[PDB]
Amino acid sequence: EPREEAGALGPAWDESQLRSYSFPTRPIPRLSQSDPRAEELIENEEPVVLTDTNLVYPALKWDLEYLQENIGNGDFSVYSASTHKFLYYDEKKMANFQNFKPNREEMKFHEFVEKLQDIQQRGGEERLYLQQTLNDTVGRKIVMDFLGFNWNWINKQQGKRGWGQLTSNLLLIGMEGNVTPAHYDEQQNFFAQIKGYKRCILFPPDQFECLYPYPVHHPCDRQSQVDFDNPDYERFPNFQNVVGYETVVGPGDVLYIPMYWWHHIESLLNGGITITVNFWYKGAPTPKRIEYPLKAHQKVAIMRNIEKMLGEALGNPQEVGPLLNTMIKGRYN
Ligand SMILES: O=C(O)CNC(=O)c1c(O)n(C2CCCCC2)c(=O)n(C2CCCCC2)c1=O
Ligand SMILES: [Zn+2]
């Protein structure tokens, strides 16, 4: 259901810019910050798109030119990929899995604009994705925009939910067609879209069985093993039962991605560059009186801890698998 831009500017996007996948989805609600329904969705840790937060209102004028002029001289982490399917490799965990081979490159902002402009010409199949946490090295005008964010609203949300401290603000600038594969994060996230359009497909924590994350010690920890473009239903049979929550966010929209919810993010094809700012918050602390049965994301937390501990106990991540199979084979299956 593509939205109609004001001023009769025509459809902002059409379904031809969306990639096709095998699973069905239901839409994420697009609500107003003043709507109590959006307030309970955040309280019940369910996704919602807020359309009128003014959270990054001063940033809605950002583009490659404005940023290059005022972002300043600093190092920005840039990730390269030979195709649309990006993928992340925890550098620290590269040691555990020696066989795997991957990617990232540091550079000043103008260098990124040159590469993005260089690849613009030639129709190069390569794609890039800038992802850098905001720090003090940003120029004057960018700090003014940063201060112009709606801190009143988001800070009130932080207290209302008892969340932890704002861990970081992440600036994401991507090329059209970029795909962030399905993965889950362990912190609460307000996904503030600025430039371009991004299709966000979320899956609840209870669909862990359908998305098959890599081992915790694997560099791709928290990412799905399933190739959405070509699912291996033999290895990943329960992916045929996956059902996602879908939406397309545009400038001014804020998507709440609750902690441990999977998200598959893609910048629309032929939609130009996309710009996003994320607000990361440590989740609310675990209550003192645990209510059973546990939430799905609590069981995911338990599973993560077991794998982590067996890695230390056995003194080798590679032994975690064999010992877990020995434990269940013919005893719990
Ligand atoms: O694209 C968006 O709008 C939202 N993107 C994200 O939340 C990303 C993300 O959470 N992650 C990792 C976070 C830590 C745990 C493993 C996944 C990414 O690597 N990436 C990219 C993945 C490809 C390689 C560079 C980093 C994310 O985008
Ligand atoms: Zn994420």
Numbering used by the authors: 15 to 116, 119 to 349
From the paper:
The transcriptional activity of the HIFs is regulated in an oxygen dependent manner by 2-oxoglutarate (2OG) and ferrous iron dependent oxygenases which catalyze the post-translational hydroxylation of HIF-α subunits. Two proline-residues, Pro402 and Pro564 in human HIF-1α, in the N- and C-terminal regions of the oxygen-dependent degradation domains, termed NODD and CODD, respectively, of HIF-α isoforms are efficiently hydroxylated by the HIF prolyl hydroxylases (PHDs or EGLNs) under normoxic conditions. In a second 2OG oxygenase-mediated mechanism of HIF regulation, factor inhibiting HIF (FIH) regulates HIF transcriptional activity via 2OG dependent hydroxylation of an asparagine-residue in the C-terminal transcriptional activation domain (CTAD) of HIF-α isoforms; such reaction reduces binding of HIF to transcriptional co-activator proteins (CBP/p300), which are histone lysine acetyltransferases.
The binding mode of GSK1278863 and related compounds (and to a lesser extent, Vadadustat) to 2OG oxygenases is of interest since it has a different scaffold to the FG-2216 related inhibitors. A structure of GSK1278863 (2.45 Å resolution, P41212 space group, 1 molecule per asymmetric unit) with FIH reveals binding to the metal via its amide oxygen (trans to Asp-201), and one ‘pyrimidine-trione’ oxygen (trans to His-279); the GSK1278863 glycinamide carboxylate is positioned to form electrostatic interactions with Lys-214 and Tyr-145. Interestingly, the oxygen of the pyrimidine-trione coordinates the metal trans to the distal histidine, as observed for Molidustat when complexed to FIH. Overlay of the FIH.Zn.GSK1278863 and PHD2.Mn.CCT6 structures reveals an angular difference of 20° (degrees) between the binding mode of the pyrimidone rings of GSK1278863 and CCT6, likely in part due to steric demands of the cyclohexyl rings in GSK1278863. FG-4592, GSK1278863 and Molidustat all manifested no sign of HIF-1α Asn803 hydroxylation inhibition (at least up to 100 μM), consistent with the isolated protein assay results (IC50s for FIH are >100 fold higher than for PHD2). The lack of inhibition of FIH by the clinical PHD inhibitors is also notable (and consistent with cellular results), since the extent to which HIF target genes are regulated by FIH activity (and FIH inhibitors) varies.
